[PDB]
């Protein structure tokens, strides 16, 4: 559900 995973 991230959408922009690297932002995590």
């Amino acid at each position: 559900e991230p959408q922009a995973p690297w932002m995590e």
């Epitope: 559900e1 991230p2 959408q3 922009a4 995973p5 995590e8």
Partner: antibody, heavy 116, light 112 residues
């Protein structure tokens, strides 16, 4: 479907410009959005992205905050403000829809040329 | 800074034969959340890239079963079975597990 970028074109070094991208066919604020750019000789480079409501953004670090990605949810529009342009910013810019880490809809691309 | 290295730079193939394209990453693409954000795009001549395969092996809507993605960790492969002329163009891998980056592309050439 469909994402349509504004006309790009010529900009003088050191000057500023704003691209827009108009989206149709989906619940706009239901999807993240992104900008990617392509040079010849060559290679694709991720430029920026923005979450559903615009409260969180990501930028390619080397841009040093010169670019701003934003979205008008009331007009279904995505913007890329570009400031203090150098020749290295010359490229084809693509608007894209971002879902679960991948770009599942791309625009036609618009070229930006930074030249005196 | 994760580097995506694609092999070969250009790939000639006969119609009906299979093409295999390699994409390696310089760091594991397994995210902490368990997903591998490795994707494949095709850019046909005079066109924008379009999504082919997402998250290693998932075909995007409209992509035929001829296109198959596989691999894990740092090593990935795109296989195109029974190549048709309209398959030609540049195939790019991309990762978004980390700060997102793209491979340099592999050009599929059709033999005649």
């Amino acid at each position: 479907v469909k994402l349509v970028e504004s006309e790009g074109g010529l900009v003088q070094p050191g000057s500023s410009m704003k691209l827009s991208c108009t989206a149709s066919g989906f619940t706009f604020s239901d999807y993240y959005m992104a900008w990617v750019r392509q040079v010849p000789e060559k290679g694709l480079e991720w430029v920026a992205n923005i979450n559903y409501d615009g409260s969180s953004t990501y930028y390619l670090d080397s841009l040093k905050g010169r670019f701003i990605i934003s979205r008008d949810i009331a007009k279904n529009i995505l913007y890329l403000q570009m400031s203090s342009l150098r020749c290295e910013d010359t490229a084809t810019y693509y608007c894209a829809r971002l879902t679960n880490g991948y770009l599942d809809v791309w625009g036609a691309g618009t070229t930006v040329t930074v030249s005196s | 800074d994760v580097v995506m290295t694609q092999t070969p730079l250009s790939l000639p193939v006969s119609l009906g034969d299979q093409a295999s394209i390699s994409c390696r990453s310089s760091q594991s693409l397994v995210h902490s959340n368990g997903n591998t954000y490795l994707h494949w795009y095709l850019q046909k001549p005079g066109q924008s890239p379009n999504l082919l395969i997402y998250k290693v092996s998932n075909r995007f809507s409209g992509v035929p079963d001829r296109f198959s993605g596989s691999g894990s960790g740092t090593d990935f492969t795109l296989k195109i079975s029974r190549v048709e002329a309209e398959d030609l163009g540049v195939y790019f891998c991309s990762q978004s597990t980390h700060v997102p980056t793209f491979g340099g592309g592999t050009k599929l050439e059709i033999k005649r």
